[PDB]
DNA sequence: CCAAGGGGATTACTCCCTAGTCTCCAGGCACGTGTCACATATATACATCCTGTTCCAGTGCCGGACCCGAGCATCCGGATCC
């Protein structure tokens, strides 16, 4: 009895906690794209058509533009997910 | 080969008798050094005084060992691109 949920279960394809990606897919459904079960960052709502080597530098620019308080909140928040990632698998 | 006694001899202290020479034998002199004298100088037993360093405390500091945590890198977990 370390964790009774184990809903992903891995096998080569899963979703991280199935909730934060769901929390990101909710704006997908609410806004114009209304995508099938795929979930990503915010900038895709502005431009659904994106590509790697190009859809990441604006995130770094935004991080530079924002403040140290926001950066610290970012470092602090998801450590909850760091703690929770060991519950269901129970190990590595 | 020496100790005792055989006779025979010049010396050297000893008598005789005089006399002139260092030495006892005492009333007086003004000296010589062994003792005396007040303190010296000499060697010794106490009380532990007071100083300034030089004999030491408290903590008037915080030196090493072991487990964590900051941000930029690469693996991996995830968007979705032909």
Swiss-Prot record:
Residues 1-92 are annotated as: Disordered. It is found in: Nucleus; Chromosome. Keywords: Chromosome, DNA condensation, DNA-binding, Nucleus, Phosphoprotein. One of its GO terms (biological process) is chromosome condensation. GO terms for cellular component: nucleosome; nucleus. Erythroid cells. It comes from the Eukaryota. The modification Phosphoserine is found at residues 48, 69. Histone H5 performs the same function as H1, being necessary for the condensation of nucleosome chains into higher order structures, and replaces histone H1 in certain cells. Belongs to the histone H1/H5 family. This is Histone H5. The lineage of its organism: Eukaryota, Metazoa, Chordata, Craniata, Vertebrata.
